[PDB]
């Protein structure tokens, strides 16, 4: 038809992957499988894994920013109380 730019994805039968040989896959009908009362007993000590790896990447930046926020806030509170109106005059303009 109208031509076409070459891409990095094709379609079923010519996806653009490398030639596959030697790999054999197996599967079983959902119909033949245990109705979903399985997970648990086999899979709940399993997961809750992927966040043992991750929680530090989230928590430590979170901690840094929460600490930094709490500190600046408590300082602003002091500045606008009676006790701090002297420091307020100093740091303001």
């Amino acid at each position: 038809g109208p031509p076409s730019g070459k891409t990095y994805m094709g379609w079923w039968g010519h996806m653009g992957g490398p030639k596959q040989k030697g790999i054999t896959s197996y599967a079983v009908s959902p119909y033949a499988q245990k109705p979903l009362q399985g997970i648990f007993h086999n899979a709940v000590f399993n997961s809750f894994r992927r966040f043992k790896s991750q929680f530090l990447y989230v928590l430590i930046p979170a901690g840094i920013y929460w600490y930094w926020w709490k500190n600046g806030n408590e300082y602003n509170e002091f500045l606008y109380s009676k006790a701090g109106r002297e420091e307020l005059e100093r740091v303001n303009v």
Partner: protein
């Protein structure tokens, strides 16, 4: 057309018609369905020494010809004679299965035979992609269950097989209660049964085989992707009928409705099959063929196909399964009638070829399971009696919204996921 079966100490079955030659053989009621995962291929190995150069020369001197066949439910060892030598075939049978069944398993014979079934089963896996796929179909459809074992055995159970495994199998299955002696050709029943009751000696009579656990269909798939092969070969089936099912013939007729096809044969493109209107427009395949495979415990009903149209495999599968949907809801009188006529023709061409070795295998397998053979004319009575209502009731039980089993090899990237195939086993309704 005859069926004379009578039991002395052994069970003797014959079917004679003045042809030319006569075939005599013993057919055991145990095949690859009786093996393990680990001695899988022992029956095929037995077959191959029975036909070894040593045993085969001893028969060719006497002017005898040797034939054997390993199946799932059964196993057969057959000698063809020239019909007055119907006695010298029984000599070769007993000289092998009593005398030489300790001389065939000589160290140099076994090692040269094992080396030959290894090149044999390897060649199969490397090159015979349609039968390779169909064998894997049984493997996944009937996984962890007797019907899953391949008849030729696997390369790994084969190369680890020893003389004692042959022995142990032969001592548990080559028994009297698991045997039938079969004669086809032109020789009479009383011509053979007397030559059998001539010599006595029972040999391991009273011994039963070993029992097991029943075969079961599991909806599943095995995908043997190989992008270097120039085609895709796929087989797809539901749980079909065992032999001695009420619907044995309804199933076989249903398969004849869609029949078989070859894109390069002009005549084949012209058959009265509605599916052909769909698949010929873009040439969705080089060939397909439907089957109703029946065994003792179960069977497979489905089709196999081969194609170079690797970007439209999903249309092949979709149009084929939409046709099968029709069997439950809209199959016509004249489709059923066309199938009756063609089922008779093909069932005829099977049961009455001009080759007695085929007759023996068909007789042997039948009498081992139901203790008798249904005559060709009796089948035609059953075939003609099938109504549209029968096919619909059958399809609604076996085809409609039922699990399937899939196997394929070659360029099958375009064969969609299981659930997509499985959803097409029915249609949306109000």
């Amino acid at each position: 057309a005859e069926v004379t079966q009578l039991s002395n100490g052994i069970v003797v079955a014959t079917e004679h018609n003045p042809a030319h030659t006569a075939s005599v053989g013993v057919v055991f009621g145990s095949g690859a369905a009786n093996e393990n995962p680990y001695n899988n291929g022992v029956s095929n190995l037995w077959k191959n020494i029975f036909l070894s150069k040593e045993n085969s020369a001893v028969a060719a001197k006497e002017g005898l010809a040797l034939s054997s066949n390993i199946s799932r439910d059964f196993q057969s060892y057959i000698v063809s004679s020239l019909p007055g030598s119907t006695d010298k075939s029984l000599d070769f049978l007993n000289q092998s299965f009593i005398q030489q069944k300790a001389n065939l398993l000589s160290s140099s014979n076994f090692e040269a035979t094992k080396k030959s079934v290894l090149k044999q089963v390897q060649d199969f896996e490397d090159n015979d992609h349609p039968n390779r796929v169909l064998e894997h179909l049984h493997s996944t459809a009937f996984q962890n269950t007797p019907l899953s074992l391949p008849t030729r055995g696997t390369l790994e159970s084969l190369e680890n097989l020893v003389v004692a495994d042959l022995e142990s199998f032969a001592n548990n299955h080559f028994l009297n209660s698991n045997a039938v002696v079969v004669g086809t050709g032109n020789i009479k029943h009383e011509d053979l049964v007397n030559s059998i009751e001539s010599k006595n000696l029972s040999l391991q009579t009273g011994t039963k085989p070993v029992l097991k656990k029943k075969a079961a269909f599991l909806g599943s798939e095995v995908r043997l992707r190989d992008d270097t092969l120039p085609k895709a070969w796929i087989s797809l089936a539901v749980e079909g009928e065992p032999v001695n099912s009420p619907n044995y013939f309804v199933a076989k007729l249903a398969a004849q409705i869609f029949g078989s096809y070859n894109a390069f044969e002009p005549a084949s493109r012209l058959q009265g099959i509605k599916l052909l209107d769909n698949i010929q427009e873009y040439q969705l395949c080089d060939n397909f063929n439907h089957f109703s495979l029946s065994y003792k415990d179960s069977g497979l009903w489905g089709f196999s196909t081969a194609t170079r149209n690797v970007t439209m495999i999903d249309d092949l599968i979709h149009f084929t399964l939409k046709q099968w949907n029709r069997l439950t809801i809209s199959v016509t009188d004249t489709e059923v009638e066309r199938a009756k006529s063609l089922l008779k023709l093909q069932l005829g061409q099977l049961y009455e070829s001009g080759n007695p070795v085929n007759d023996a295998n068909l007789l042997g397998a039948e009498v081992l399971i139901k203790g008798s053979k249904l005559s060709l004319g009796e089948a035609f009575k059953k075939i003609d009696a099938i109504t549209v209502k029968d096919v619909k009731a059958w399809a609604g039980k076996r085809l409609w919204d039922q699990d399937i089993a899939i196997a394929g090899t070659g360029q099958i990237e375009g064969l969609l996921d299981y659930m997509r195939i499985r959803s097409d086993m029915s249609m949306m309704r109000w």
